[PDB]
């Protein structure tokens, strides 16, 4: 699993460690030049509505991730936080669409999704004019939880459940992961809004 691609994987404090002890994000921010601007850009690219650049395109991805979150936190724009998390998750999707099976399965576990592999089921579909097959299955109870606030496409009726489990294909699994990620973000912003920040840092991120 590439932390360079999926920043959220790594804990902020685990990253802050490599910079010293008692190192606080603001401390780096106050002294870093690029960071705050890299965040500002991201917040813009969304404020405008343009594709967000993958995190691998950065030098300090993890640090940039947490910084754009901490900025969103300081900005105080629910509309923006929501607008961002959507654009953000979209971006991560693209990355996953090229990820390994074992890898996809890992982000789920990390993201708290109970999706696993199972003796895939094959059946003749009429749209593909060929046999289709699903190998990923979630338990119907959970699946209902996970899809509670999604769209009609996820409705259990259009689904394929067998022996208590709802069968999924890679594309589906991804969309599900993409979904938790979108939420994970909104949740990751809270612990940053926690402590008090320096007036100097505030004004910097506001300009």
């Amino acid at each position: 699993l590439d932390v360079k691609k999926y920043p959220f994987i790594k804990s902020l404090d685990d990253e802050l460690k490599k910079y010293g002890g008692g190192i606080t994000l603001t401390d780096l921010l106050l002294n870093s030049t690029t960071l705050i601007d890299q965040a500002k850009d991201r917040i813009q690219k969304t404020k405008s509505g343009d594709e967000l650049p993958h995190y691998v395109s950065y030098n300090e991805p993890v640090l940039v991730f947490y910084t754009t979150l901490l900025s969103l936190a300081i900005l105080n724009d629910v509309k923006l936080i929501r607008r961002y998390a959507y654009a953000e998750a979209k971006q991560f999707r693209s990355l996953l669409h090229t990820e390994n099976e074992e890898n996809l399965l890992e982000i789920s576990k990390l993201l708290d999704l109970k999706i696993n592999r199972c003796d895939p089921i094959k059946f003749y579909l009429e749209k593909k004019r060929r046999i289709i097959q699903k190998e990923f299955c979630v338990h119907f109870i959970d699946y209902l939880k996970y899809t509670k606030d999604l769209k009609e496409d996820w409705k259990l009726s259009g689904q394929i459940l067998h022996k208590g489990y709802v069968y999924l294909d890679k594309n589906q699994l991804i969309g599900l992961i993409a979904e938790s990620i979108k939420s994970k973000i909104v949740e990751m912003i809270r612990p940053l809004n926690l402590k008090e920040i320096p007036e100097k840092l505030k004004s910097l991120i506001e300009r």
Binding site: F123, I141, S157, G158, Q159
Partner: protein
């Protein structure tokens, strides 16, 4: 001057009392957490918010205090089954229920007459005799078969797709009721999630699967097997707070037990679904010819008849006459 003034004692209530006196109702272990309700005879309104904690407690209340024409218990589990306010009650899980929608399924024949002159009235009262008119709904075995089908398909979807372990029960009158005693995180399914399952089982959003083998695993195979959705009453399923007519109770509209069907194939719609024995003298209100418990019975207004208790009670609760005596 020599006219005897003596009221006919209700034998029906006798039968019921005797039944409940020895009947062994199918009660949940978490009895103390469920609210019991009951519609008494001669009263349209329910006697709710009761709460027992022993078969005996329940038995005594019925045989001594109030006799139920209809007897249920909430599907929901509470902490204060007796409380009056939802906030006080404290819901903490509800069972998963399904009920074959017999109203939609069968379309049965009904009749409105005057118990006195035994004529057909359209209105609710008979001007001639200034009496309230009655209504008879002929329940056929053709219709019971229709319900038994859907129940079959239902148990399939329940076991095959959701991997659950359903329990089937005769409604006691017009159809069936399937129930899953799920206590897991299942019991906490919100009404909306429940509505999901309901639509799934009803084949709502379900597409057709033109190609699909009969051996597909879900609606894929099912659709290709002729089945296009189970006919249930969603409201029952989506309703987190609902009354489960207690298994082994007698259905006020038939006097038939709320028996549990273990083999849908063996199920027969006889007078065997009635616990009552002896014979009863029945006095028909009207001359009619109809199917009763899977058999045609010819009735003539006024002419007493000595039939089995089963049919007797049945025909009586169905508004076709009165059970004048027992043997």
């Amino acid at each position: 001057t020599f006219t005897l003034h003596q009221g006919q004692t209700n034998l029906i209530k006798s039968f019921f009392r005797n039944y409940y006196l020895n009947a062994e109702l199918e009660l949940p272990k978490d009895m103390e957490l469920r609210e019991f309700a009951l519609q008494p005879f001669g009263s349209d309104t329910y006697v709710r918010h009761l709460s027992f904690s022993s078969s005996e407690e329940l038995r005594d209340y019925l045989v001594n205090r109030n006799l139920p024409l209809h007897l249920f218990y909430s599907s929901a589990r509470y902490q204060l089954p007796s409380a009056r306010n939802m906030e006080e009650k404290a819901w903490m899980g509800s069972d998963l229920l399904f009920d074959i929608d017999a109203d939609h399924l069968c379309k049965l024949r009904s009749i409105r007459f005057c118990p006195v002159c035994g004529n057909a009235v359209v209105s609710e009262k008979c001007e001639r005799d200034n009496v309230e008119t009655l209504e008879y709904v002929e329940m056929t075995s053709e219709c019971i078969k229709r319900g038994l089908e859907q129940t079959r398909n239902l148990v399939e979807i329940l076991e095959d797709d959701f991997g659950l372990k359903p329990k089937v029960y005769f409604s006691g009158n017009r159809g069936f009721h399937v129930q899953v005693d799920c206590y897991g995180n299942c019991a906490l399914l919100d009404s909306d999630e429940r509505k999901e399952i309901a639509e799934y089982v009803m084949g709502i959003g379900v597409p057709g699967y033109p190609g699909g083998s009969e051996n597909a695993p879900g609606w894929v195979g099912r659709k290709n097997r002729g089945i296009n959705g189970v006919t249930i009453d969603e409201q029952v399923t989506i309703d987190v707070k609902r009354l489960i007519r207690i298994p082994n109770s007698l259905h006020g509209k038939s006097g038939l037990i709320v028996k549990r069907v273990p083999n849908l194939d063996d199920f027969e719609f006889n007078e065997t679904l009635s616990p009552f024995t002896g014979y009863t003298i029945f006095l028909p209100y009207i001359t009619i010819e109809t199917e009763v418990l899977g058999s045609i019975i010819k009735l003539n207004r006024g002419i007493p008849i000595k039939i089995k208790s089963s049919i007797g009670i049945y025909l009586h609760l169905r508004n076709l006459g009165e059970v004048k005596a027992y043997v």
